């Protein structure tokens, strides 16, 4: 069943029921205008709107253009019969298209049902129609028949492509916001459509070209219908409730009014810009209005002005407002049904839902402004089908939304000249001249802090009882049909219906052309530096903005100097074709570049050119940009820092019931539930603030990146075309070059770069959200949790205390996880948030790492990282920090005071890699010295050391102390914990236990539940305190703190990640290095050392022991290691300029005998699988297999060497075979068929203390 | 007995008795080498080769106790079973178990094998003397028997003379962790079973005892052996109940006073002689040790700076030394002691130490590379920043200066000194008699013993040993003759066996007491030995006459 029945053409007679001359209300006297009814209470008037508004009597453009991004003005539109018929067909087709959709069907049914309320009677016990909510259709006989209607569609006013929904007001009553409702006249035109540009679609169609998409008129008509539906039930927000912004700064939009009504109508992302408190206020206000009108309906008992019985009218209004009578004629509202109706009219009917149902493109947010005016034709079915629209099926327009792309579907949209000039509303920026005008619609959107309000501070009292397409489909089944208010005979009114439109608030004109004087080159300056005029003279690229803005015929570019040198070079025809291909290759190379440094937290893909592209942070070096990025987080991208402040959350007042057993458990359950509700509400408020104030800037930066890339591509294309133009005719025809393919490939390269830029910006936005916004709310929530826990425990103070205490302790000890999926519905951002949550390090609280010649807290919780003047950093790997026993060899960490909560350190983890040299002096015995301190007022946790012991101490105010110790002996042949890197992690849970793991294996655990008040601290002291030994020192690196207990799996994952398996390691655990002599030790036989025997072909190398003994009585006794012939590793094919060896490197091995080097080689032709190794003079024969590939992974198994032949055949793993009595060294292929193939490199170290005799 | 004596007199002395005398002197040689290998080989085998200087233990002596049982088990049995069969079995078991002892790993099994070998051989001497006593002429009986004695002494001499040639290195007993080489003790044990092996080869031809055979019965066999002996001489000249009652019949019966006096004399001689024979080498070793200990150099407050040591320093003690930046390379430490010495960055290379011991020393920054200075050589020492690299395996001693060759050479001279003193008793026992000789020799040896207090020197000690041994062999010979001549042929083997067992018991007593009283006093063991000799030589007169 179609919506509009029996299509009307235009020139059908004046019958009087479906096509007739009508007289709408107006200020004075108006000639009757032919209007056609398309459905119940819906009329269309194919005429220009010059009747309702007496001021709008002219069709010429006004002298002062409106604050509008795009607008088309016309005078001859809709003046001919063909134009009116085309308008009618377009409107009817759009109505049918909306009606087909289930959501559209519900919207049209609701609009038809919702007639305006009859409140025109002065006496309170009567119902009378509003005189301004009705029309007069004049019959051909001569008299008129006054009729009541709901919607009217009129062609647009002077502004052709300005669509709005007007209403006729009353003298005292606000019909559109008090629930009474009033008729809505929509100014809509289907022949014209705004055009936008979309740059976030490549995720589905990478083959797509440029943007320039055309808005589907069905969506616009749906938006107007939603406005009419809101105003028909009288629940529209007052127009003065407007989303105010700031305009003083130079980076702010001069003026952009957006009422709360538009935010409600847009829905989706836009509707989140209004906090929950204002939604609650509006819902309560409109509930009170509905109750008031229900009471008014109840009181009245008489009706004047119509034949129809009163009971029918009361039933009509009851089914419109979903009132609930109780068989006694007593109408009343119920909260459930009104909540359902309000949610349907506010949240279900939204433009985003219509976009999803129609499956068409639209601007996801109102910030993505329109750009052009497109004249379109809707009547023919070959251009716009009823079911699909511009995306016609079974054609090339079916996929990738090619039906809405103006550059593919050119024949369907005609571009028009919009009257708002590109520089009509601008801001004039310049430095201390070169002043540039920047369009107002190309500036950052900065909402004020007034629009966000909180009721968090206000307290709450608890008593016994204190409490998606599938959802749309469920509403569709639940919806009621088949009941549409039947047409009612109304006694005819006066010939002229006097009535004035609803009064609108006055909008002051924002000032134009404000002059700003700054001290730096802003991003708009860089963007306007890259533009040019497509002039006749040659255009040359340059790297100096100070000259690009000054000289019109020279364009700035952020690419490398080689590219600008190339594109500026005069090339003959014989090399032109090669030149173009080289140019496109360099374009792809520069745009697709990425940043290797990844130690950053989820900013893995850093795009360097962005720095010089916009002058981000006011540095013009890509390396400087990456350094500043790593140093300062995602703050440098933001133009202005949002100010987020959560008030102290209110307390929970618990009522006590006398001698009751069930209600108290209900109070406890209610308290826990409301705790969860408070957590969710604070998280939602923070998400709303972040979406309103942060993501908009990132989106603008993304759009500006796209614009800059387009500008660079256009500049290169213009240079190429100008060079082509210079040739002679024979040169052009012999050497043929076309522009379309070049443009297509440059566009594809731009898209390829744009994917990476989008990923980087999404990662930055999510990182900022989870780093600089969430903690400020988590602190408040957990402080509130601690405050509520004591009140609950006091409240428990019948016969069920133990279970309740366990429940409350376990409930409030932990925290509710933050999952973004419950607050936003953006797939692209949710994927990156899941990636952020995946890594454990990203959720750490303190993440001290050395990056870009600075020791910084990558988790951004620390305020001051103070470094002493006697703290050493290893030059090869600067992460390893060496701390001495000096008063000035300390590191201090001062955390942010507004992030640290009092009840921290209840469930938390710590992890660090530590290297402790051997204990030499006898003073070290029975001497405990703190190496990490976080105690204030004798309370907190400290990591201390002792003779062969690592101690973790937890102490409370009452002087109670709990210690967990890990003890390793020094009197062993070979030790895995003496002067070797060990990964110590400690996990404390206040409820059950505190445990310490060494190298990812549980070592010790002890209860801590007896402790009292462990009052948290703020400073962290990396300093050796109380150590009596004067030369004592330690190595510490990769310190990390976590705000939750860590299970064994996470500990093992941390050990695997931080181990850095890509780099082979020596005995002590450092990085293996080239051109360094290491002694060799075999793990299979650690009691024997490698020795050489008659260097040359006829000699070999074997293993002989025992190693020996190094002793200090009463202190230590360890087998000597600096024994045997030293091995050095000379590079062979490593392209890296550093001397650090890595996995699968190919290397040469030299053995030192009598301070002379011999290459480690063998002859592989000898019989048997075993190939005994030998040492040969470096001027040897290259035919012998000598190249050794070093491996450290299979799971990692130490450091293994694999002898390879010169032809790539694998001779096999190095190792030892007991070839007769003498245990020789061999390259065996048995070891390749996986011990004895695992080795350890022992370099001379100053922490071991053995003298290499 | 008259007819047997007359026919034996008519048979005379010729080829057969000489051949038998040789094949029995072989067994007496075996007895002598057993006494040597028990008294001067085992007691030096338990020594510590590692200690360049060691004492003397007597663990092996227990085999002497075993000899006792043999001298009563294989000694008294022969009188009830036979003389050729018992000697054959005894020497056969001795030879077999000695050869088995040669192929033995471990000290315990070797000592058990030596004990059973002693069991076998301890019953040889009574049987050989009783055997040869029933073959020689009655008138010319004292001479030839006396001659047999020399073989006994020769045994020790031979056992000594070869010993220093084969095993002049103590500690070969308590060491089984060594390689299959160093088996000089193995070949020595193999070759010490040579005389018994040749005697076993020889005894197949010799016939049984004619007098004993006649005593048992089968007088035709006795007549046959008498005829064979006569023909050889002409051609040349041209049951344990019964045995225990038999032993009791030798003591608590008609033979009561004679056996008591004989037992007293045998105990006295086997006490004094077997005490002094082992006392003398011990005394000479103690004299050498004292001469060594006199030249001990005490060092106090030294400051040795930057000195490289290349030679050998011996017999020194250092106290409060401060050895700074020294260097000991390829040298020998001999009997040198360190106390309270403070080393400093010293270097030890290829240093070989013997009996040196570090005490309370502070050893700092040193290197011990290629050395045998093990942990046990350090007593209450504090190392500082030191190291212990490759270390020579096994202890090392300058065996050239660690050979107790003298202890075997002295025994050789002591056993040799009796040869001139035995002939003057062989061709004399038919003139002075059989009781004046024993008493006179005992008293003269006692007088010589009382002169030993005067002497204190190496030459003096060896001279006194030679004199005493020379004048204490006629006593043994006269004792053998008087103890083989008294008892009849039905009790001779048993009584000789019990007397030999008592002799071995006295050997144990003397070789324990005298060898223990070294370095404590000299007049006590000498006075005790002189008293024993005087008592024996005064009691031996109160014996029945046999002439
Ligand atoms: C062990 O010696 C201790 C200190 O004596 C040192 O004196 C120096 C002067 C030098 O000789 C070092 O070699 C010494 O070690 C002393 O206090 C102890 O009491 C000594 N112990 C004993 C029981 O001798
Ligand atoms: C003593 O030292 C010197 C100097 O090195 C050396 O030539 C000599 O061989 C050493 N003495 C001995 C016996 O080796």
Curated annotation (Swiss-Prot), chain A:
Hydrolase: present as a keyword of the record?
yes
Region C-terminus of receptor binding domain (C-RBD), residue ranges: 1060-1253
The protein's GO terms of the molecular function aspect are: ganglioside GT1b binding; metalloendopeptidase activity; protein transmembrane transporter activity; toxin activity; zinc ion binding
| Ligand binding (Zn(2+)) | 223, 227, 262
Instruction: Relate the outcome reported for changing residue 920 to G.
Output: Whole toxin has 50-fold reduction in toxicity, almost no binding of RBD to neurons
The disulfide bonds in this chain are: 430-435, 1199-1237
Q: Which segment of this protein is annotated as the motif Host ganglioside-binding motif?
A: 1228-1231
Write out the GO cellular component annotations.
extracellular region; host cell cytoplasmic vesicle; host cell cytosol; host cell plasma membrane; host cell presynaptic membrane; membrane
**According to the UniProt record, what happens if one changes residue 1085 to A?**
Decreased binding of NTNHA by RBD at pH 7.5
Q: Which residues cross the membrane?
A: 600-620, 629-649
- Impact of changing residue 1231 to S on the protein? Nearly complete loss of toxicity, heavy chain has very strongly reduced binding to synaptosomes, binds much less GT1b. RBD protects against neurotoxin considerably less well than wild-type
- Quote the annotated effect of residue 967 to A: Decreased binding of NTNHA by RBD at pH 6.0, none at pH 7.5
Binding-site positions, a ganglioside GT1b (d18:1(4E)): 1084, 1170
Q: Which family does it belong to?
A: Belongs to the peptidase M27 family.
Protein name per the record = Botulinum neurotoxin type A
**Protein source organism:** Clostridium botulinum
UniProtKB/Swiss-Prot annotation, chain B:
Which PROSITE patterns did the record assign?
MFS
Ranges in coiled-coil conformation? none
Residues in compartment: Extracellular: 39-57, 113-114, 168-186, 281-404, 456-461, 519-522
Q: Which residues carry this modification: Phosphotyrosine?
A: 292
Membrane topology per the entry is: Multi-pass membrane protein
The subcellular localization recorded is: Cytoplasmic vesicle, Secretory vesicle, Synaptic vesicle membrane; Cytoplasmic vesicle, Secretory vesicle, Acrosome
Glycosylated residue positions:
310, 360, 385
In alphabetical order, the GO MF annotations are: transmembrane transporter activity
Q: Which residues lie on this side of the membrane: Cytoplasmic?
A: 79-91, 136-146, 426-434, 483-495
Transmembrane residue ranges: 18-38, 58-78, 92-112, 115-135, 147-167, 187-207, 260-280, 405-425, 435-455, 462-482, 496-518, 523-541
Source domain of life is: Eukaryota
| PTM remark | N-glycosylated.
Q: What Gene3D superfamilies does the annotation carry?
A: E3 ubiquitin-protein ligase SopA, MFS general substrate transporter like domains
Q: What is its main location?
A: membrane
Biological processes annotated in GO: chemical synaptic transmission; neurotransmitter transport; regulation of presynaptic cytosolic calcium ion concentration; regulation of synaptic vesicle exocytosis
Taken from the record, one Pfam family name reads: Sugar_tr
Keyword tags: Cytoplasmic vesicle, Glycoprotein, Membrane, Neurotransmitter transport, Phosphoprotein, Synapse, Transmembrane, Transmembrane helix, Transport
Instruction: Give GO cellular component annotations, separated by semicolons.
Output: acrosomal vesicle; membrane; plasma membrane; synaptic vesicle; synaptic vesicle membrane
How does it associate, per the subunit comment?
A: Interacts with SYT1 in a calcium-independent manner. Forms a complex with SYT1, syntaxin-1 and SNAP25.
Write out the similarity annotation.
Belongs to the major facilitator superfamily.
Query: What job does this protein perform?
Result: Probably plays a role in the control of regulated secretion in neural and endocrine cells. (Microbial infection) Receptor for the C.botulinum neurotoxin type A2 (BoNT/A, botA); glycosylation is not essential but enhances the interaction. Probably also serves as a receptor for the closely related C.botulinum neurotoxin type A1.
Q: Which PANTHER family match?
A: SYNAPTIC VESICLE GLYCOPROTEIN 2 (PTHR23511), SYNAPTIC VESICLE GLYCOPROTEIN 2B (PTHR23511:SF2)
The name this protein carries in UniProt is Synaptic vesicle glycoprotein 2B
Which species expresses this protein natively? Homo sapiens
């Amino acid at each position: 069943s179609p919506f509009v029945n029996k299509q009307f053409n235009y020139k059908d007679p004046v019958n009087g029921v479906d096509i007739a001359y009508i007289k709408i209300p107006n200020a004075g006297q108006m000639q009757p205008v032919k209007a056609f009814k398309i459905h119940n209470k819906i009329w269309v008037i194919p005429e220009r709107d010059t009747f309702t508004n007496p001021e709008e009597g002219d069709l010429n453009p006004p002298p002062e253009a409106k604050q509008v991004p795009v607008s088309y003005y016309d005078s001859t539109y809709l003046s001919t019969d063909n134009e009116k018929d085309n308008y009618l067909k377009g409107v009817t087709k759009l109505f049918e298209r909306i009606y087909s959709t289930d959501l559209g069907r519900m919207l049209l049914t609701s609009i038809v049902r919702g007639i305006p309320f009859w409140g025109g009677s002065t006496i309170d016990t009567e119902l009378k129609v509003i005189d301004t909510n009705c029309i007069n259709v004049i019959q051909p006989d001569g008299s008129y028949r006054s009729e009541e209607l709901n919607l009217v569609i009129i062609g647009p006013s002077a502004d052709i492509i300005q669509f709005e929904c007007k209403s006729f007001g009353h003298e005292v009553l606000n019909l559109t916001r008090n629930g009474y409702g009033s008729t809505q006249y929509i100014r809509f035109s289907p022949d014209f459509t705004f055009g936008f540009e979309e740059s976030l679609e490549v995720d589905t169609n990478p083959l797509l070209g440029a943007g320039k998409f055309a808005t589907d008129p069905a969506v616009t008509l749906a938006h107007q219908l939603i406005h009419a539906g809101h105003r028909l039930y009288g629940i529209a927000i007052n127009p003065n409730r407007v989303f105010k912004v700031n305009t003083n700064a130079y980076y702010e939009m001069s003026g952009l009014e957006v009422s709360f009504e538009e935010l409600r109508t847009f829905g989706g992302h836009d509707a989140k810009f209004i906090d929950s408190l204002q939604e609650n206020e509006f819902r309560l206000y409109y509930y009170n209005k509905f109750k008031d009108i229900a009471s008014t309906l109840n009181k009245a008992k008489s009706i004047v002005g119509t034949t129809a019985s009163l009971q029918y009218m009361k039933n009509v209004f009851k089914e419109k407002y979903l009132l609930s009578e109780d068989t006694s004629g007593k109408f009343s509202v119920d909260k459930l049904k009104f909540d359902k109706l309000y949610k349907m009219l506010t949240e279900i009917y939204t433009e985003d839902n219509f976009v999803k149902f129609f499956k068409v493109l639209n601007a996801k947010t109102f910030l993505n402004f329109d750009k052009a005016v497109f004249k379109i034709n809707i009547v023919p079915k070959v251009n716009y089908t009823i079911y699909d629209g511009f995306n016609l099926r079974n054609t090339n327009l079916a996929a990738n939304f090619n039906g809405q792309n103006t550059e593919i579907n050119n024949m369907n949209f005609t571009k028009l000249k919009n009257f708002t000039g590109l520089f009509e509303f601008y801001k004039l920026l310049c430095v201390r001249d070169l002043c540039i005008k920047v369009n107002n619609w190309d500036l950052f959107f900065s909402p004020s802090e007034d629009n966000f309000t909180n009721d968090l501070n206000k307290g709450e009292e608890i008593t016994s009882d204190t409490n998606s397409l599938d959802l749309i489909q469920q509403y569709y089944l639940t919806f009621n049909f088949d009941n549409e208010p039947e047409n009612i005979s109304i006694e005819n009114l006066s010939s002229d219906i006097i009535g004035q439109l609803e009064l609108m608030p006055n909008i002051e004109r924002f000032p134009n052309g404000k002059k700003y004087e700054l001290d730096k080159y802003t991003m708009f300056h860089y963007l306007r530096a890259q533009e040019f005029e497509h002039g006749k003279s040659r255009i040359a690229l340059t790297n100096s903005v100070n000259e690009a803005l000054l000289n019109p015929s020279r364009v700035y570019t952020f690419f490398s100097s080689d590219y600008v040198k190339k594109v500026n070079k005069a090339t003959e025809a014989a090399m032109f074709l090669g030149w173009v291909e080289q140019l496109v290759y360099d374009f792809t190379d520069e745009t697709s570049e990425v940043s290797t440094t990844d130690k950053i937290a989820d900013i893995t893909i850093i795009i360097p050119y962005i720095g010089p592209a916009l002058n981000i942070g006011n540095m013009l070096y890509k390396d400087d940009f990456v350094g500043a990025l790593i140093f300062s987080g995602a703050v440098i991208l933001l133009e202005f820092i949002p100010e987020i402040a959560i008030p102290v959350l209110g307390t929970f007042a618990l009522v006590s019931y006398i001698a009751n057993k069930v209600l108290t458990v209900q109070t406890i359950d209610n308290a826990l539930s409301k705790r969860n509700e408070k957590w969710d509400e604070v998280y939602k408020y923070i998400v709303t603030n972040w979406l309103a104030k942060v993501n908009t800037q990132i989106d603008l930066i993304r759009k500006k990146m796209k614009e800059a890339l387009e500008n660079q591509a256009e500049a290169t294309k213009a240079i190429i075309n100008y060079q082509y133009n210079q040739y002679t005719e024979e040169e052009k025809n012999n050497i043929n070059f076309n522009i379309d393919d070049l443009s297509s490939k440059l566009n594809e390269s731009i898209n390829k770069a744009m994917i990476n830029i989008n990923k980087f910006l999404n990662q930055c936005s999510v990182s900022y959200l989870m780093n600089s916004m969430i903690p400020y709310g988590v602190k408040r929530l957990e402080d509130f949790d601690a405050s509520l826990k004591d009140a609950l425990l006091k409240y428990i103070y019948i016969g069920q205390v133990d279970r309740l205490k366990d429940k409350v302790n376990n409930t409030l000890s932990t925290d509710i996880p933050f999952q973004l999926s419950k607050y936003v519905d953006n797939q692209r951002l949710l994927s990156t948030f899941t990636e952020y949550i995946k890594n454990i390090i990203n959720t750490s609280i303190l993440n001290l790492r050395y990056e870009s010649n600075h020791l910084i807290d990558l988790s951004r919780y620390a305020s001051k990282i103070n470094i002493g003047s006697k703290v050493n950093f290893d030059p090869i790997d600067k992460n390893q920090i060496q701390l001495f026993n000096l008063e000035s060899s300390k590191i201090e960490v001062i955390l942010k005071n507004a992030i640290v909560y009092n009840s921290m350190y209840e469930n938390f983890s710590t992890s660090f890699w530590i290297r402790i040299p051997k204990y030499f002096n006898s003073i070290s015995l029975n001497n405990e010295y703190t190496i990490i301190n976080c105690m204030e007022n004798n309370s907190g946790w400290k990591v201390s050391l002792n003779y062969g012991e690592i101690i973790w101490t937890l102490q409370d105010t009452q002087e109670i102390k709990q210690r967990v110790v890990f003890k390793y002996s020094q009197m062993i042949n070979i030790s895995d914990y003496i002067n070797r890197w060990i990964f110590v992690t400690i996990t404390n849970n206040r409820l059950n236990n505190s445990k310490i793991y060494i190298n990812g294996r549980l070592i010790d655990q002890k209860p801590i539940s007896n402790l009292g008040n462990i009052h948290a601290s703020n400073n962290i002291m990396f300093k050796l305190d109380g150590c009596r030994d004067t030369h004592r020192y330690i190595w510490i690196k990769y310190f990390n703190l976590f705000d939750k207990e860590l299970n064994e799996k996470e500990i093992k994952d941390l050990y695997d990640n931080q181990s850095n398996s890509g780099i082979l390691k020596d005995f002590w655990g450092d990085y293996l290095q080239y051109d360094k002599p290491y002694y060799m030790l075999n793990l299979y036989d650690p009691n024997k050392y490698v020795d050489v025997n008659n260097v040359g072909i006829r000699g070999y190398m074997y293993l002989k022991g025992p190693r020996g003994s190094v002793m200090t009585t009463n202190i230590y006794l360890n087998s000597s290691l600096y024994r045997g012939a030293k091995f050095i590793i000379k590079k062979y094919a490593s392209g890296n300029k550093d001397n650090i060896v890595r996995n699968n490197d190919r290397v040469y091995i030299n053995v030192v005998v009598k301070n002379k080097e011999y290459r480690l080689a063998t002859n592989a032709s000898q019989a048997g699988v075993e190939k005994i190794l030998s040492a040969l003079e470096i001027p040897d024969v290259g035919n012998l297999s000598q190249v050794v590939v070093m491996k450290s992974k299979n799971i990692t198994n130490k450091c293994k060497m694999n002898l390879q032949d010169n032809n790539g055949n694998d001779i096999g793993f190095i190792g030892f075979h007991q070839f007769n009595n003498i245990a020789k060294l061999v390259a065996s292929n048995w070891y390749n068929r996986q011990l004895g193939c695992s080795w350890e490199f022992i370099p001379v170290d100053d922490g071991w203390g053995e003298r290499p005799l | 007995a008259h007819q047997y004596e007359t026919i034996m007199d008519e048979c005379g002395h010729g080829r057969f008795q000489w051949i038998l005398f040789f094949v029995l002197g072989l067994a007496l040689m075996a007895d002598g080498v057993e006494v040597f290998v028990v008294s001067f080989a085992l007691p030096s085998a338990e020594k510590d080769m590692c200690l360049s200087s060691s004492k003397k233990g007597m663990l092996g002596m227990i085999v002497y106790l075993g000899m006792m049982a043999g001298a009563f088990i294989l000694g008294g049995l022969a009188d009830k079973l036979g003389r050729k069969r018992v000697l054959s079995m005894s020497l056969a078991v001795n030879a077999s178990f000695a050869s088995l002892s040669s192929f033995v790993q471990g000290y315990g099994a070797f000592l058990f094998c030596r004990l059973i070998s002693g069991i076998g051989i301890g019953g040889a001497l009574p049987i050989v003397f009783a055997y040869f006593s029933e073959f020689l002429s009655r008138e010319k009986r004292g001479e030839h028997l006396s001659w047999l004695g020399i073989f006994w002494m020769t045994g020790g001499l031979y056992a000594s003379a070869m010993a220093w040639s084969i095993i002049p290195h103590y500690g070969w007993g308590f060491s089984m962790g060594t390689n299959y080489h160093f088996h000089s003790w193995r070949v020595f044990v193999i070759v010490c079973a040579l005389p018994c092996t040749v005697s076993m080869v020889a005894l197949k031809f010799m016939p049984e005892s004619p007098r004993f055979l006649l005593e048992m019965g089968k007088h035709d066999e006795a007549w046959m052996i008498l005829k064979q002996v006569h023909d050889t001489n002409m051609r040349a000249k041209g049951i344990f109940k019964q045995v225990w009652d038999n032993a009791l019949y030798c003591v608590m019966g008609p033979y009561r006073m004679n056996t008591l006096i004989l037992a007293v004399v045998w105990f006295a001689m086997a006490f004094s002689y077997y005490g002094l024979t082992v006392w003398f080498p011990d005394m000479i070793r103690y004299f050498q040790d004292e001469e060594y200990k006199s030249k001990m150099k005490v060092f106090f407050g030294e400051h040795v700076y930057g000195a490289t040591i290349n030679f050998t320093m011996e017999n020194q003690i250092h106290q409060h030394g401060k050895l700074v930046n020294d260097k000991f390379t390829r040298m020998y430490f001999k009997h040198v002691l360190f106390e309270d010495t403070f080393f400093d960055e010293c270097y030890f290379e290829d240093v070989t130490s013997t009996d040196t011991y570090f005490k309370n020393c502070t050893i700092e920054s040193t290197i011990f590379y290629n050395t045998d200075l093990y942990e046990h050589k350090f007593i209450n020492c504090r190392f500082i920043n030191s190291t212990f690299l490759e270390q020579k395996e096994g202890c090392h001693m300058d065996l050239e200066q660690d050979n107790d060759f003298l202890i075997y050479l002295v025994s050789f001279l002591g056993s040799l000194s009796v040869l001139p003193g035995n002939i003057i008793s062989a061709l004399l026992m038919d003139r002075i008699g059989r009781l004046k000789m024993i008493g006179g020799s005992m008293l003269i040896s006692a007088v010589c013993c009382f002169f030993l207090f005067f002497g204190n020197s190496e030459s003096a000690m060896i001279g006194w040993q030679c004199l005493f041994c020379g004048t204490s062999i006629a006593a043994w010979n006269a004792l053998d003759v008087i103890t083989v001549e008294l008892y009849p042929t039905n009790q001779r083997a048993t009584a000789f066996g019990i007397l030999n067992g008592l002799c071995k018991f006295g050997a144990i007593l003397g070789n324990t007491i005298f060898a223990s009283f070294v370095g404590i006093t000299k007049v006590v063991p000498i006075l005790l030995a002189a008293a024993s000799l005087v008592g024996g030589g005064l009691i031996a007169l109160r014996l029945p006459e046999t002439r």
